[PDB]
């Protein structure tokens, strides 16, 4: 009892097939533009974090060698002082050109005390 129904009705489902895959085309282009944006954001965030890190690393290294130089400033001061007191033993040891050198003691008592207590 169909006039043109067997053709028009068999055309409708063929139309909504194209409609539905047109929707899948849109939803798939939407997923790839979302992921392409996320990869774009990820590289920008990684570039700025690389910037922040390469600033902190050089600030902390120059502070590290600051501590290192402070240790050298300390050990060099103490080494030069622990030999500065030993230079005072030469102005008393050898000669004062025989003025009044051989009389008494004042600082060699420390050296004598340290040498005696090393009897072990």
């Amino acid at each position: 009892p169909a006039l043109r129904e067997q053709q028009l009705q068999q055309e409708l489902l063929a139309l909504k097939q194209k409609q539905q895959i047109q929707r899948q085309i849109l939803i798939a282009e939407f997923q790839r533009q979302h992921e392409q944006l996320s990869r774009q954001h990820e590289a920008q965030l990684h570039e700025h974090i690389k910037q922040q890190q390469e600033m902190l690393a050089m600030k902390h290294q120059q502070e590290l060698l600051e501590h290192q130089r402070k240790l050298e400033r300390h050990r060099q001061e103490q080494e030069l002082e622990k030999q500065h007191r030993e230079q005072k033993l030469q102005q008393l040891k050898n000669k004062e050109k025989g003025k009044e050198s051989a009389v008494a003691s004042t600082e060699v008592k420390m050296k004598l005390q340290e040498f005696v207590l090393n009897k072990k």
């Binding site: 008393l92 040891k93 051989a102 009389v103 060699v108």
Partner: protein
Amino acid sequence: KKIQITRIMDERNRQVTFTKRKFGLMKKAYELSVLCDCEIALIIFNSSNKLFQYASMDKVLLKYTEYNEPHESRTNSDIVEA
């Protein structure tokens, strides 16, 4: 007279004997220091805890602090055993 090697019980006799034998001991050290060209140091603490030292001081003491070899050291008991 010939006295014995014992503590002088008297105060004044021990005092002036201390002075005279001290000065004579410096003199014997003076003769040895010059005759044989040797350096001598002598440190004396009396019974009254006062210092009396003699040097032929800093140089001799500092030499003694820089010598760690076996050497002759004597004591009062070693003088008795001698």
